[PDB]
């Protein structure tokens, strides 16, 4: 009974991986330049297809109760994902002209609320694996990430001073 402990990992590890990005980016995403904003759609337009095979897998890793929500959540991820990647795609042609750093602070919103949602997905149904659990037959932090996120939102503040086509449109519109 410990040889699926892999996927049940996995599923839980990328939902904090893609959150380090999310932020990170969110950084340097002012300085951000045409050379490293290319690439930094790759990273995040991975997070959102990747949630949907790590979830997938987590189904069944986590007690039948939260299958409705994490069902919707399945689609939901999809329009994201081409939220994220259509903004972020502006700024890769609007930053030749002069109004860069503009759609960049999109960008930051909703990529706000995409390593929020990332997360809120495994912290919801975290509550059922841990109800069963704590009760009867009990046979990378979440903390981390609760800081981090924190100061992704001052760093927009201010300055230092189908669901499986869509997919694959979309990578080929990004590859060329």
Known sequence: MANLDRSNDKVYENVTGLVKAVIEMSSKIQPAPPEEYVPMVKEVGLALRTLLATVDESLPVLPASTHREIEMAQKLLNSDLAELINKMKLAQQYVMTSLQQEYKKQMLTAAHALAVDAKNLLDVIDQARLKMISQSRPHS????????????????????????????????????
């Open 141 to 176: 932090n979440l903390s981390e990430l609760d800081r981090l996120l924190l100061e992704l939102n001052a760093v927009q503040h201010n300055p230092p001073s189908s669901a499986t086509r869509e997919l694959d449109e979309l990578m080929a519109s990004l590859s060329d």
